[PDB]
Design an enzyme around this catalytic site. Structure first.
Site, mmCIF file in Angstrom:
data_model
loop_
_atom_site.group_PDB
_atom_site.id
_atom_site.type_symbol
_atom_site.label_atom_id
_atom_site.label_comp_id
_atom_site.label_asym_id
_atom_site.label_seq_id
_atom_site.Cartn_x
_atom_site.Cartn_y
_atom_site.Cartn_z
ATOM 1 N N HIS A 10 0.710 -1.283 0.000
ATOM 2 C CA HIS A 10 0.000 0.000 0.000
ATOM 3 C C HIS A 10 0.733 1.325 0.000
ATOM 4 O O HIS A 10 0.096 2.347 -0.187
ATOM 5 C CB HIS A 10 -0.944 0.008 1.206
ATOM 6 C CG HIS A 10 -1.932 -1.112 1.196
ATOM 7 N ND1 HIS A 10 -3.007 -1.138 0.336
ATOM 8 C CD2 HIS A 10 -2.019 -2.234 1.951
ATOM 9 C CE1 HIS A 10 -3.725 -2.224 0.569
ATOM 10 N NE2 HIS A 10 -3.147 -2.906 1.546
ATOM 11 N N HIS A 103 -2.863 -3.428 8.186
ATOM 12 C CA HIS A 103 -3.965 -3.780 7.319
ATOM 13 C C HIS A 103 -4.651 -2.494 6.896
ATOM 14 O O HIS A 103 -4.813 -1.600 7.701
ATOM 15 C CB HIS A 103 -4.949 -4.672 8.081
ATOM 16 C CG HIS A 103 -6.257 -4.862 7.380
ATOM 17 N ND1 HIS A 103 -6.368 -5.503 6.162
ATOM 18 C CD2 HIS A 103 -7.514 -4.518 7.738
ATOM 19 C CE1 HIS A 103 -7.638 -5.545 5.803
ATOM 20 N NE2 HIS A 103 -8.354 -4.954 6.742
#
Length: 111
Positions: A10, A103
């Site tokens: 990410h 996450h």
DNA sequence: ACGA
């Protein structure tokens, strides 16, 4: 799942210019198929990690906005799959474990 | 379901 994997999946230093190309990476294969969606956070690792400072175990919605590029799969094909892109600046929710983002939990709000 |  952990800080290293969160960064690898990410976090990127520059804006995504092509979702199709960036998503062509074995890191985005789940169950043998190209992943459904992945949000890229255009920032430094240190700035993203700061979201979790002082947080041991909880989802945290960032207090500052981040530049985001989200790649969404349009069709499941043999690799590489086609993706559409969405860009926006918004707060992000991440799971903080031991002060580390582990996450990507949501855009704009936590679940 | 954008990690266990």
């Amino acid at each position: 799942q952990n800080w290293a994997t969160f960064q690898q999946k990410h976090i990127i230093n520059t804006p995504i210019i092509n979702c199709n190309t960036i998503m062509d990476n074995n890191i985005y294969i789940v169950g043998g198929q190209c992943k459904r969606v992945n949000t890229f956070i255009i920032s430094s690792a240190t700035t993203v990690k700061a979201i979790c400072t002082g947080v041991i175990n909880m989802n945290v919605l960032s207090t500052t906005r981040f530049q985001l590029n989200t790649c969404t799969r349009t069709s499941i094909t043999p690799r590489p799959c086609p993706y559409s892109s969405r860009t926006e600046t918004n707060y992000i929710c991440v799971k903080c474990e031991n002060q580390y983002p582990v996450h990507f939990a949501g855009i704009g709000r936590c679940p």
